[PDB]
Design a protein around this nucleic acid. Structure first.
Ligand SMILES: CSCC[C@H](N)C(O)=S
Ligand SMILES: [K+]
Ligand SMILES: [K+]
Ligand SMILES: [K+]
Ligand SMILES: [K+]
Ligand SMILES: [K+]
Ligand SMILES: [K+]
Ligand SMILES: [K+]
Ligand SMILES: [K+]
Ligand SMILES: [K+]
Ligand SMILES: [K+]
Ligand SMILES: [K+]
Ligand SMILES: [Mg+2]
Ligand SMILES: [Mg+2]
Ligand SMILES: [Mg+2]
Ligand SMILES: [Mg+2]
Ligand SMILES: [Mg+2]
Ligand SMILES: [Mg+2]
Ligand SMILES: [Mg+2]
Ligand SMILES: [Mg+2]
Ligand SMILES: [Mg+2]
Ligand SMILES: [Mg+2]
Ligand SMILES: [Mg+2]
Ligand SMILES: [Mg+2]
Ligand SMILES: [Mg+2]
Ligand SMILES: [Mg+2]
Ligand SMILES: [Mg+2]
Ligand SMILES: [Mg+2]
Ligand SMILES: [Mg+2]
Ligand SMILES: [Mg+2]
Ligand SMILES: [Mg+2]
Ligand SMILES: [Mg+2]
Ligand SMILES: [Mg+2]
Ligand SMILES: [Mg+2]
Ligand SMILES: [Mg+2]
Ligand SMILES: [Mg+2]
Ligand SMILES: [Mg+2]
Ligand SMILES: [Mg+2]
Ligand SMILES: [Mg+2]
Ligand SMILES: [Mg+2]
Ligand SMILES: [Mg+2]
Ligand SMILES: [Mg+2]
Ligand SMILES: [Mg+2]
Ligand SMILES: [Mg+2]
Ligand SMILES: [Mg+2]
Lengths: 58, 94, 116, 78, 135
RNA sequence: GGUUCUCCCCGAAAGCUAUUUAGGUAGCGCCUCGUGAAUUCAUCUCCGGGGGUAGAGCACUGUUUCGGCAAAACCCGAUGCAAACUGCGAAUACCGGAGAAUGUUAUCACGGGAGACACACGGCGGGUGCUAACGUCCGUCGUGAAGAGGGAAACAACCCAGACCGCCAGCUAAGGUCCCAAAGUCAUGGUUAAGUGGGAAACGAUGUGGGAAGGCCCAGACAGCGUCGAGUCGGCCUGCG
RNA sequence: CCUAAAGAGUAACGGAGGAGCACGAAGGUUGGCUAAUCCUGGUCGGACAUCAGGAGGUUAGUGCAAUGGCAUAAGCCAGC
RNA sequence: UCAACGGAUAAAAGGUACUCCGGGGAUAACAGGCUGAUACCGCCCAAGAGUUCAUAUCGACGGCGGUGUUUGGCACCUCG
RNA sequence: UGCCUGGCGGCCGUAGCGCGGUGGUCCCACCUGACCCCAUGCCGAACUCAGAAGUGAAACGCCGUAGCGCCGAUGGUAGUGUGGGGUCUCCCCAUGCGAGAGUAGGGAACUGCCAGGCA
């Protein structure tokens, strides 16, 4: 029901493969790109994994 | 005669514990009896001076925590490996 | 100790029967008595039993711990097994030599109509 | 000077091939091992080189049984 | 010079020297010399510090050496280029912060401090004087 | 050694195995084109697994120090050490199952065409070497290679960041804002006097800031000579020099 | 076997050892069995031979390296 | 028989300063570079020597640095 | 129904050793014989058979007792994934995971099927 807005804040260049796969899983494509996703534990786990390069709008 | 003041700890674990010691306090635990264990903070310099006296380990001490007084004996102490500091104390309820 | 030494003797065969998942005919033997049990594959369920401690069988016998008593118990356990309808069992000598009284029990159970 | 060492043997690719909960066909090797680090439980066979293999289809289950705390592998028929 | 009487193996991997020490308390005597730094102590350094320490107390009281050089160090000869690990040249003890190196008993603290000061000048690692605690 | 017009799309490798093989070549891995079959594959969450690494420990295998008992070992204790020690034991990683969302179909098979099999540096875990080398050999990730732009004076491999084309628009990243040279001679509170900042150790020393105790003290201390009248003595921790 | 980073794999003129066989029983099966070491006593007999009992609990054994195994023994003995 | 153990032929040694060609700074010798074990130059501790007295002059056992004259390590530049 | 005993499983030391007490009608054990069935690389010890005078000594089972083995928190510490930092042979910070050892404390087990004896 509830959605969250996620924005990519740093580059993916030089990041671990897993991190690149996570951004892809969130559907983030470039710095500044914002996406809207359902707030679930699976989504939260992804955000958690790349928290250093995304910001969340609750 | 030895009286100690002690807050109750909000956070626990490595991060919190290291923050305490950076702010010149140190963690401690009271256990024993039928009451559940109580995790506390102590001022470092104050207790460091007390425990220099050898009566600290023999005598029964009082810990004033949230008003209430608790009679304890110093059970175990973790010292810093080379600096003259205390990392942790175990107090057993007397 | 004798009992522990016998439990050792019995383990190989018992573990094997558990693996095969066979209905056992477990025999126990003392100087005075001899017992018999048909235990189910799971191992925690006795189907039938017979012994020289039972007064139905013991009253007919001269002595309880001899070949002739074992022969009687062998006949007894087999008849009760065929009553429920088991037939196929595996004999478990339980660490005793297949000889004398144990053999006597086993022979009597075969003749009665158990298939082993 | 010189060295008297410099030798080794080929690696034998031992170890667990199918972990807990994995579905295996009968025949499937579960573990390759020197000696029985794991023992065969229900529906598992032990080969001449102590390979544990499924004797039935089902799910692999590891379990510790007995006083020695021995590790058994069994197949839960599924 | 301290050295194992025998060993399973002649030569040892370099390894690393992370972590804090075990044996951080004065267990035997009344006064200790404790490592504050991290490093290696050779058998020769351990002996040189022992001699200075012993002489300073005029062979009064008792001295324990808590550290033992059990790690063999190899070196390659000069003008050698590979062609196998070098030969064992000396032995070391790995020291971590907090390790009590030496203990001493049956002397005044004043004299113990002096002896350990003389000993410390022979060692490559920073040390500190420590005393036995009740707990 | 050299190999001649243009534009568009994708885009490696410098590994393994074998080789009279080592600067060659072959199969496989990695690229490309095509055809075909799966909600195939990836990320996260939950669930099911095995582990013997880090750490730790010392019953075992070895090694080590000191004691208490004894014909000066064991027995009874205290204390360490281990790549080839383990009565313990993570994080991660890996295998499998389930579920959502997202993704350039990224997975798998077969077929057409390859190139490549001299790698480099940086991080992390290591062997070797002197915990020497812009050294050497592995693992794993990143970048260069095959990657321009901004930063690090200058500087493949570091930091930020991935250039379809145009603009005399705007916002940011690392990094910066006295002049060279774009932007604070910005604000508040501290520290340093060494141009420290802007090269380095053991160790030395009334440099100076902060913190916590202690000894002595108007029953007159410390310095100077019983005299004179307020703070002083000598260590600890710590910031900057 | 270690290096090898708790799945597999993983290099060096890295650290250590082995093989180039043996066995018609040392294979199969059935039945049975359980070690080392030390202490106490005992002809020759001694530190150590064989006998008895106790403690011990696999510290033994496994045809040959090392590692992983082995009591239901994979160790030891006999029948066929 | 292929142990050079995926085995060139069944059958396989040397010299060349009389030399030659194709190549390589993928690889040595010179010099440069990186490094600084070694070398050289300092310093710290102070047992002791110095009639007495550690420090006039020395300085054991050990410790910490500097330089880039040595011997080396590496193989980065140069073998059209 | 309860108690006790035997057998077969479920449960692996909180279930094991020790120490103190306790049980023999049945059961179990030792025990009594051995010419035989069968047995000893000698031995009726064991195995086995034929028995039931004796005995609960040993063994076995049951009850008590922390004396050990053993089990074992809480807290702290070590390590560590990801991101960041330093004085970078080693560490620190944010966040997540978090031992081993030790401490308090505990511990003298629990449970199904069948049979037998007793009240
Ligand atoms: C001295 S480390 C360099 C390599 C060595 N010469 C071997 S061959
Ligand atoms: K190839
Ligand atoms: K292809
Ligand atoms: K040990
Ligand atoms: K690397
Ligand atoms: K790239
Ligand atoms: K300056
Ligand atoms: K045989
Ligand atoms: K045989
Ligand atoms: K060859
Ligand atoms: K000539
Ligand atoms: K040249
Ligand atoms: Mg942390
Ligand atoms: Mg191997
Ligand atoms: Mg390591
Ligand atoms: Mg592209
Ligand atoms: Mg370790
Ligand atoms: Mg090649
Ligand atoms: Mg290559
Ligand atoms: Mg490489
Ligand atoms: Mg490295
Ligand atoms: Mg290199
Ligand atoms: Mg390097
Ligand atoms: Mg190229
Ligand atoms: Mg660039
Ligand atoms: Mg640039
Ligand atoms: Mg520039
Ligand atoms: Mg702006
Ligand atoms: Mg300007
Ligand atoms: Mg201003
Ligand atoms: Mg300067
Ligand atoms: Mg592995
Ligand atoms: Mg791994
Ligand atoms: Mg590889
Ligand atoms: Mg070959
Ligand atoms: Mg030429
Ligand atoms: Mg070159
Ligand atoms: Mg040169
Ligand atoms: Mg040179
Ligand atoms: Mg190279
Ligand atoms: Mg040049
Ligand atoms: Mg040049
Ligand atoms: Mg030219
Ligand atoms: Mg904890
Ligand atoms: Mg624990």
């Amino acid at each position: 029901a509830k959605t969250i807005k996620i924005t990519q804040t740093r580059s993916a260049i030089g990041r671990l493969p897993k991190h690149k796969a996570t951004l892809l899983g969130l559907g983030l494509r470039r710095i500044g790109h914002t996406v809207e996703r359902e707030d679930t534990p699976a989504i939260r786990g992804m955000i958690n994994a790349v928290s250093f390069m995304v910001k969340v709008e609750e | 005669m030895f009286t100690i003041n002690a807050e109750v700890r909000k956070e626990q674990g490595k991060g919190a514990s290291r923050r305490l010691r950076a702010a010149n306090k140190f963690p401690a635990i009271i256990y024993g009896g039928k009451e559940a264990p109580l995790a506390i903070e102590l001022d470092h310099d104050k207790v460091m001076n007390m425990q220099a006296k050898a009566e600290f380990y023999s005598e029964v001490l009082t810990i004033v925590v949230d008003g209430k007084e608790i009679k304890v004996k110093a059970q175990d102490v973790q010292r810093h490996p080379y600096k003259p500091k205390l990392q942790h104390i175990d107090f057993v309820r007397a | 100790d004798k009992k522990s030494a016998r439990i050792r003797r019995a383990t190989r065969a018992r573990r094997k029967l558990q693996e095969l998942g066979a209905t056992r005919l477990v025999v126990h033997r003392t100087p005075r008595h001899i017992y018999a049990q048909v235990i189910a594959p799971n191992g925690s369920e006795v189907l039938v039993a017979a012994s020289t401690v039972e007064k139905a069988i013991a009253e007919q016998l001269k002595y309880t711990g001899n070949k002739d008593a074992a022969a009687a118990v062998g006949k007894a356990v087999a008849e009760r097994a065929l009553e429920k309808g088991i037939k196929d069992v595996s004999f478990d000598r339980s660490g005793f030599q297949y000889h004398g009284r144990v053999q006597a029990l086993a022979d009597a159970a075969r003749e009665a109509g158990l298939q082993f | 000077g010189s060295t008297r060492n410099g030798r080794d043997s080929e690696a034998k690719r031992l170890g667990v091939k199918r972990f807990g909960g994995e579905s295996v066909l009968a025949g499937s090797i579960i573990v390759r091992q020197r000696g029985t680090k794991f023992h065969a439980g229900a529906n598992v066979g032990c080969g001449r080189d102590h390979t544990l293999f499924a004797k039935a289809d089902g799910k692999v289950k590891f379990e510790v049984k007995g006083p020695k705390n021995r590790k058994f592998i069994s197949i839960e028929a599924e | 010079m301290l050295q194992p009487k025998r060993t399973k193996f002649r030569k040892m991997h370099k390894g690393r020297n992370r972590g804090l020490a075990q044996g951080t308390d004065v267990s035997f005597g009344s006064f200790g010399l404790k490592a504050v730094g991290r490093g290696r102590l050779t058998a020769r350094q351990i002996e040189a510090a022992r001699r200075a320490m012993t002489r300073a107390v005029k062979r009064q009281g008792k001295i324990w050496i808590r550290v033992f050089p059990d790690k063999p160090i190899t070196e390659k000869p000069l003008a050698v280029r590979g062609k196998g690990k070098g030969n064992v040249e000396y032995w070391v003890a790995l020291i971590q912060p907090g390790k009590v190196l030496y203990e001493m008993d049956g002397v005044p603290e004043e004299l113990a401090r002096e002896a350990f000061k003389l000993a410390a000048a022979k060692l490559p690692i920073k040390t500190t004087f420590v005393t036995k605690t009740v707990m």
